[PDB]
């Protein structure tokens, strides 16, 4: 209710939301992929 009122968005940077959504987690092995994807998305 509060998030719908405020119109929030989630940046998808935690392990719980990346486990819900279904990508690699931003830890362990997947941290290299996540910093690569975030520098690609910042780079264009």
């Amino acid at each position: 209710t509060e998030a719908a009122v405020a119109g929030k968005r989630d940046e998808l940077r935690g392990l719980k939301e990346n486990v819900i959504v279904g990508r690699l987690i931003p830890a362990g092995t997947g941290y290299a992929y996540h910093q690569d994807r975030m520098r690609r998305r910042a780079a264009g």
């Binding site: 486990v19 279904g22 990508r23 690699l24 987690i25 092995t29 998305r41």
Partner: protein
């Protein structure tokens, strides 16, 4: 002894002479249901009580009423085996005769208008078996007794609620048996309140305000009266000496000439002695003492006619001036104290905004039904209905007992509703509790919790159903036709039968029966559950209800509870624990008589136990003299202490009476810790019966009690000699002494061969008597599933060594020899039922036939021409048992093949096929063959019945012939079958012969007509499910040998899992050459503290030493005198043993049969808490020519050499539990899927996968295996495209992963979007 008791005399070790036999262990179920169903016209219990408590019932005007006449229960048209097979309730019809008497409205009471009476049929109440089990829908269910809080009043107090103050708040509560509660409580301001059924608080005086009471009655009822008297502008105080206790003097309380107290001085008890020794009454009191007091009664001025002051007003100087000028010379005043009479009711009267009964009733209706537009008649009707309606409030005859005996009264009767003085006295005791005199109640003291059993619950459900049908039939009769209406048209039999069937089928307490073994049945019947309707839950009941209250001593076992979330909510009933009249629990106790315990047995309930002092069973008695020690031990007043040998009142009745049945079956109970003995007494309840039942050598003497009273053996009814014993049935010829002459003199004991249990184990009955062998009444004849000769025999006893063995018994693990498998000591039988139904689609009925398409001779070759497996073909998993096919198109066109298959992992033979049908489909060759075999076996068995019956009735007619006249030579010179044609002159014996021949022909008539009844019931269809045609049921019977993974356990909570089946050469042996069978783990003993297995291992080795010496003497065949001497010396052994057996009364063949029965060991009885001490065990071992410590010197079969230290070896009784590794192991590669979330299923039946839960997701997260977590949440799970690419890629050899958004996340998106909150996936 009996003839079966001479067959094997179990040696005792107990020393206390037991004084009471073990009671009939199923008395609670049978006595409660017999009280529910039995016709009591005087002592109203059950059905007659409910009928008379609802009948009669009149109309709205009163011109017609229904009178109850009588009721009778007919025969069940099916017996219990037929109901178990067919899958239906075993029940009797309830036929009630009922009278309709119509009244006239022309006359004032025109009773003679029209008389009508008939029997109306309503309801089908289910009956009980002989041994306390109900049979519903074919299955055997058991209704567990319930332990709710009894009706009445319970004064309680929560300690530490207002954490700022920490004050105690005593709260009362009136729990009735039926209706609504009534809760009084204080606040931290010490104001009484009323909370009817967890609504808001109300000022507590409003109930008695609604009860037509004014404030004057309130103050004179609750507060004691003090009197001020104004005289010539001074105040005279009438003073009783019981008022100045523990306070400070406001003024100088003096006398006419005596001084007692000073200013600001505490009134002392010596000063009170001075006042009671001078005995003055009137004392003058100054003006400042009045300021603080409160006026009792109203004072209206006589001149102006208005009220100077009402009741409950604070006095002041202007107020006393107004009273003196009005002239009220006598002043009534309340008594206010802080010690014994606190200002509580006065404060609630002050804060109470109501004034009269009208405002009280509209306020209480505004609370009870809020928001409704209130009125006076609705408020008063709901108030009468809420407490003082007989049809809306019942607590009688047990709550009336507890209410009077908690209100310090004497009589145990009264009315079934509350009343004014009753609520007044409850409030009075609450104020006494609040000021200090009295004592609060605890809530788990067993004078408060009451056993509510199956009879009471069934009567309550019958009463609720009858009330609903009474309301319906009154709504019918109030306007319907009077003269031309029979009552069977107006009594709808629907809600009674629906209610009783609902209770016996789907209640909280009618639960499915675990019958792994007779112990499980008996301790599932004697079970005390505290859950269900009216009791607590398995969430909302913390440490208080679970803990062992000290009044559980003797009534409830302390070491038999489940270990799950029901750690104290499921009590088990102790051995000797009976039930009261009202329903409380009670134990037997022996009365002392001037220091002598006379064997008259007084029963003590939970409350009457507390006032006496009770001695303990371990207290010694000197041959019916007195105690030895002057300071005996006792338990008293809720604890334990010491007392004198004359001050006592009662002694224990035995020493088994603390523990229940199951924990009494454990030997050496007094040496196990309570945790591990609880683990053992729960793991004896799960022992699958093995192939040949084998007795325990170390028992407790309760085994014969469990196997007899568990109702699974075939115990004789009248003693006699056996006439013919078979493997299928035993018949017996009765003694002529124990025969009544009206009968024929032959009982028949049919046995149930290889029938499925409720947990798919086997149940059969092998006979234990041979032909030409006399038995007495109460003897055993046929052993049950896990019984050896009428003893309970759950597992097998086997050789045990206690040492580490190359790691293979590491952390509670068991290493089992090969010879345990080779002797097949642990191969159970599992009988499994598979069902096939011919449903009906709307394209034709499904066909059971062998012309199935798409199949060949790799499957159809086991089946017959009819499409049904033979009786006896060994199937394997996945083969067709019943070939069923379904019309696919309209009526090949039967293309879909819906045959049965054996589930993968099930094997074995097909012991029975049973086929049911509906009338409407014509049978086939297989159904005709099954019904022909049933017909022929029914005719065969009932004609054998007729044949032994004509043997008996020909004995009967030869008896009446030799009684009437003397006719012997023509009686035996002529065949016995033509004894109906012989006769003489017509007299009473001739007429008896004609009527007995007519009785024989009528026996033939009921014979052939019950054959025709079973014939038409098997040819005609049974009342099956809606929309089936014929039902074929098969029964597969595997034989489960042991293998690594089958759980095993002794009796003392030493569970294990079999780790290796070593060969006989690798098992350790001893120097004589005998290899040991189980190498247990020695480190299981010293920390878990179950020393019972160590003492039982030593005693088992002693027992086998004696049995081995007897086997040596028999195999050398020494002498019957040497056998008699050795066995007599073996029995007359202990110090002060209870039993005594002399073999001079035993014959030669008797002692030969006894030595043959003892050649496999000498069984021993170690009573729980009367056990065999280690000196007695070492005496037994010295008799056996063994090492006295029990430890022998084992060798090593692996490398030949010697173990360095002596190893303990004996014979512990190992079970085999119901956790079999074949049922446990399950795997899944790719299978079924759910519909909502598209993730795989869950469970071994649906072939589902293991839930990789949240904790395992955190495990992968904190490892960092991100790719493993992603592939475990997308492609191994709910993602259809990714999993299809994954499966295809793995088959092609390349392991690569294309992920995607999971289907459960898409479900969550659709659910929030349908909830109305716009959630979407924003790109970049």
């Amino acid at each position: 002894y009996s003839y079966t008791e001479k067959k094997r005399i179990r040696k005792d070790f107990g020393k206390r002479p037991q004084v009471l036999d073990v009671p009939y262990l199923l008395s609670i179920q049978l006595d409660s249901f017999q009280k529910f169903i039995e016709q009591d016209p005087e002592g109203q219990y059950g059905l007659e009580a409910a009928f008379r408590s609802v009948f009669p019932i009149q109309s709205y005007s009163g011109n017609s009423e229904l009178q109850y006449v009588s009721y009778r229960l007919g025969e069940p048209v099916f017996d219990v085996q037929e109901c178990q097979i067919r899958g239906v309730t075993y029940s009797a019809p309830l036929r009630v005769k009922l009278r309709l008497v119509i009244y006239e409205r022309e006359a004032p009471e025109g009773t003679v208008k029209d008389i009508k009476e008939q029997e109306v049929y309503m309801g089908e109440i289910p009956l009980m078996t002989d041994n306390g089990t109900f049979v519903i829908n074919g299955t055997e269910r058991v209704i567990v007794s319930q332990l709710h809080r009894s009706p009445g009043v319970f004064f309680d107090s929560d300690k530490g609620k207002t954490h700022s103050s920490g004050k105690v708040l005593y709260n009362a509560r009136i729990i009735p048996y039926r209706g609504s509660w009534l809760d009084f409580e204080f606040d931290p301001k010490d104001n009484l309140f009323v909370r009817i059924d967890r609504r808001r608080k109300l000022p507590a005086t409003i109930i008695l305000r609604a009860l037509n009471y004014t404030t004057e009655q309130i103050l004179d009822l609750f507060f004691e009266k003090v009197i001020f008297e104004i005289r010539d502008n001074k105040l005279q105080m009438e003073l009783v000496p019981e008022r100045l206790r523990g306070e400070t003097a406001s003024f100088d309380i003096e006398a006419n000439g005596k001084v007692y107290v000073e200013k600001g001085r505490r009134i002392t008890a010596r000063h009170i002695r001075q006042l009671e020794k001078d005995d003055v009454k009137l004392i003058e009191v100054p003006v400042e003492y009045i300021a603080g007091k409160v006026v009792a009664k109203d004072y209206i001025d006589e001149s102006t006619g208005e009220l100077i002051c009402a009741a409950n007003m604070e006095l002041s100087l202007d107020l006393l001036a107004k009273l003196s000028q009005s002239g009220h010379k006598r002043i009534e005043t309340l008594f206010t104290n802080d010690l014994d009479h606190g200002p509580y009711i006065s404060e609630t009267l002050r804060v109470d905004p109501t004034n009269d009964r009208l405002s009280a009733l509209v306020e209480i209706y505004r609370m009870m039904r809020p928001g409704e537009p209130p009125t006076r008649e609705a408020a008063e009707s709901l108030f009468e209905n809420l407490f003082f309606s007989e049809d809306r409030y019942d607590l009688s005859a047990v709550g009336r007992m507890k209410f009077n005996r908690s209100l310090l009264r004497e009589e145990i009767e009264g009315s079934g509703i509350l009343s004014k003085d009753d609520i007044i006295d409850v409030m009075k005791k609450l104020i006494d509790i609040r000021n200090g005199k009295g004592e609060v109640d605890d809530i788990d003291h067993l004078g408060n919790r009451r056993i509510r059993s199956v009879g009471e619950m069934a009567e309550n459900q019958f009463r609720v159903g009858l009330v609903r049908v009474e309301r319906a039939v009154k709504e019918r009769l109030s306007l319907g036709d009077l003269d031309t209406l029979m009552p069977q048209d107006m009594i709808n039999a629907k809600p009674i039968s629906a209610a009783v069937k609902e209770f016996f089928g789907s209640s909280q307490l009618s639960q499915f029966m675990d019958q792994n073994n007779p112990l499980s049945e008996i301790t599932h019947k004697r079970r005390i559950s505290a859950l269900g309707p009216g009791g607590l839950t398995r969430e909302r009941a913390g440490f208080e209800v679970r803990d062992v209250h000290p009044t559980h001593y003797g009534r409830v076992c302390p070491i038999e509870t489940p270990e799950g979330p029901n750690i104290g909510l499921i009590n088990s009933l102790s051995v000797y624990a009976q039930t009261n009249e009202y329903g409380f629990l009670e134990t037997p106790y022996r009365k002392v008589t001037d220091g002598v315990v006379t064997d008259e047995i007084h029963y003590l309930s939970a409350i009457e136990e507390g006032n006496y002092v009770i001695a303990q069973a371990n207290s010694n008695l000197d041959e019916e003299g007195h105690f030895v020690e002057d300071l005996v031990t006792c338990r008293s007043k809720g604890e334990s202490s010491l007392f004198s040998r004359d001050q006592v009142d009662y002694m224990d009745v035995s020493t088994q009476q603390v523990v229940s049945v199951g924990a009494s079956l454990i030997p050496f109970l007094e040496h196990d810790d309570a945790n591990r003995a609880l683990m053992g007494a729960n793991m004896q309840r799960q022992a699958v019966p093995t192939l040949r039942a084998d007795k325990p050598l170390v028992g407790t003497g309760m085994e014969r009690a469990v196997a007899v009273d568990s109702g699974v053996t075939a115990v004789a009814k009248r003693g006699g000699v056996v006439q013919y014993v078979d493997a299928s049935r035993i018949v017996i010829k009765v003694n002529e002494d124990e025969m009544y002459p009206g009968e024929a003199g032959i009982d028949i004991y049919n046995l149930t061969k290889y029938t499925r249990s409720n947990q798919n184990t086997c149940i059969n009955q092998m006979p234990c008597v041979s032909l030409g062998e006399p038995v007495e009444r109460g003897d055993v004849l046929a052993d049950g599933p896990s019984t050896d000769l009428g003893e309970l025999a759950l597992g097998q006893n086997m050789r045990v060594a206690f040492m580490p063995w190359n790691g293979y018994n590491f952390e509670d693990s068991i290493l089992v020899s090969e010879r345990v498998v080779q002797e097949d000591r642990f191969t159970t039988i599992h009988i499994q039922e598979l069902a096939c139904v011919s449903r009906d689609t709307k394209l034709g009925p499904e066909e059971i036939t062998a012309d199935i398409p798409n199949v060949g001779e790799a499957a159809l070759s086991k089946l017959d021409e009819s499409g049904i497996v033979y009786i006896g073909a060994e199937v394997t998993g996945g083969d067709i048992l019943v070939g069923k096919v379904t019309p696919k198109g309209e009526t090949a066109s039967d293309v879909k093949d819906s045959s049965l298959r054996v589930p993968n992992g099930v094997s074995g033979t097909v012991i029975d096929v049973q086929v049911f049908t509906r009338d409407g489909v014509e049978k086939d060759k297989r159904a005709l063959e099954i019904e022909e075999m049933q017909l022929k076996q029914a005719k065969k068995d009932l004609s054998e019945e007729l044949q032994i019956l004509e043997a008996g009735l020909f004995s009967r007619i030869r008896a009446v012939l030799v009684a009437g006249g003397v006719e012997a030579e023509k009686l035996d010179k002529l065949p016995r079958d033509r004894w109906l044609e012989l006769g003489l002159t017509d007299e009473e014996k001739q007429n008896q012969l004609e009527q007995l021949a007519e009785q024989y022909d009528e026996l033939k008539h009921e014979f052939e007509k019950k054959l025709e009844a079973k014939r038409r019931k098997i040819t005609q269809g049974d009342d099956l499910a809606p929309g089936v045609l014929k039902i074929v049921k098969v029964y597969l019977a595997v034989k489960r040998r042991i293998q690594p993974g089958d759980k095993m356990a002794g009796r003392h909570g030493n569970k294990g899992v079999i780790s290796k089946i070593n060969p006989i050469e690798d098992m350790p042996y001893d120097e004589n050459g005998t290899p040991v069978d189980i190498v247990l783990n020695p480190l299981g003993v010293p920390s878990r503290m179950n020393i019972g297995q160590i003492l039982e291992t030593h005693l088992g080795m002693a027992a086998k030493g004696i049995g081995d010496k007897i086997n040596a003497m028999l195999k050398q065949q020494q002498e019957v005198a040497k056998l008699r001497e050795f066995i007599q010396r073996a029995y007359d052994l202990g110090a002060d043993v209870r039993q005594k057996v002399d073999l001079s009364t035993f014959s030669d063949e008797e002692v030969m049969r006894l030595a043959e029965n003892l050649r496999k060991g000498m069984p021993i009885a170690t009573p729980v808490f009367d056990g065999a001490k280690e000196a007695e065990i070492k005496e037994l071992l010295k008799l056996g020519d063994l090492p006295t410590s029990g430890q022998i010197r084992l060798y090593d079969g692996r490398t030949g050499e010697q173990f360095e230290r002596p190893v303990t070896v004996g014979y512990m009784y190992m079970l085999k539990l119901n956790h079999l590794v074949d049922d446990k192991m399950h795997a899944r590669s790719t299978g079924s899927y759910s519909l909502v979330t598209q993730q795989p299923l869950g469970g071994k039946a649906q072939f589902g996968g293991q839930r990789f839960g949240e904790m395992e997701v955190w495990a992968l997260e904190a490892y960092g295996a991100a790719y493993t977590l992603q592939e475990m949440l997308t492609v191994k799970s709910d993602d259809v495209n990714g999993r299809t690419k994954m499966y295809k890629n793995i088959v092609d050899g390349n392991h690569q992963m294309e992920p995607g958004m999971p289907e459960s996340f898409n479900v969550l998106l659709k659910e929030i979007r349908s909830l109305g909150i716009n959630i979407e996936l924003e790109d970049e």
